[PDB]
Amino acid sequence: VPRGSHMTLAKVFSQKLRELGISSIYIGHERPSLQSLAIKMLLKNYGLVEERREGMLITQDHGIKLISGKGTETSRYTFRKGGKKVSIHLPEYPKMVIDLGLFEFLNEEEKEKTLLQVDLCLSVIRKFLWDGNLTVVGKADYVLGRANIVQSLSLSDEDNPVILDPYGDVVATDQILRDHNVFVIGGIVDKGRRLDRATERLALSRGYSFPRVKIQLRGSIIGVPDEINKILEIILRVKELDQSLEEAIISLQ
- DSSP letters along 26-74, please? E-TTS-S-HHHHHHHHHHS-EEEEEEEEEEEEEEEETTEEEEEEEEEEE
CA-nearest of 89, 83, 86, 90 to 45 is 83
CA-nearest of 128, 125, 131 to 35 is 128
Residues whose CB falls within 8 Å of the CB of residue 88, separated by 6 or more in sequence, listed in order: 12, 13, 15, 16, 38
CB 112 within 8 A of CB 197: no
Helix axes 108-128, 228-241, angle to 10 degrees: 20
Distance CA 78, CA 41 (A): 12
CB 158 within 8 A of CB 181: yes
Vertex 65 angle, CA 63 and 70, to 5°: 165
Distance CA 175, CA 143 (A): 33
Distance CA 160, CA 176 (A): 11
User: How far apart, in Å, are the Cα atoms of 230 and each of 25, 70, 84?
Assistant: 33, 38, 35
Alpha-helix runs per DSSP H in the chain: 8-19, 34-43, 108-128, 174-178, 197-206, 228-241, 245-252
Residues whose CB falls within 8 Å of the CB of residue 169, separated by 6 or more in sequence, listed in order: 212, 214
- Name residue 47's beta-bridge partners: 80
CA-nearest of 168, 165, 151 to 228 is 165
Residues whose CB falls within 8 Å of the CB of residue 235, separated by 6 or more in sequence, listed in order: 96, 164, 177, 183
Residue type, 226: D
Distance CA 202, CA 204 (A): 6
CB 199 within 8 A of CB 209: no
Distance CA 84, CA 154 (A): 34
CA-nearest of 228, 186, 168 to 101 is 186
User: How far apart, in Å, are the Cα atoms of 202 and each of 54, 63, 196?
Assistant: 56, 43, 10
**C-alpha 230, offset from chain centre:** 11
Resolution, given in Å to one decimal, reads: 2.4
Q: How many CA atoms lie within 13 A of 144 on its CB side?
A: 30
Residue type, 77: Y
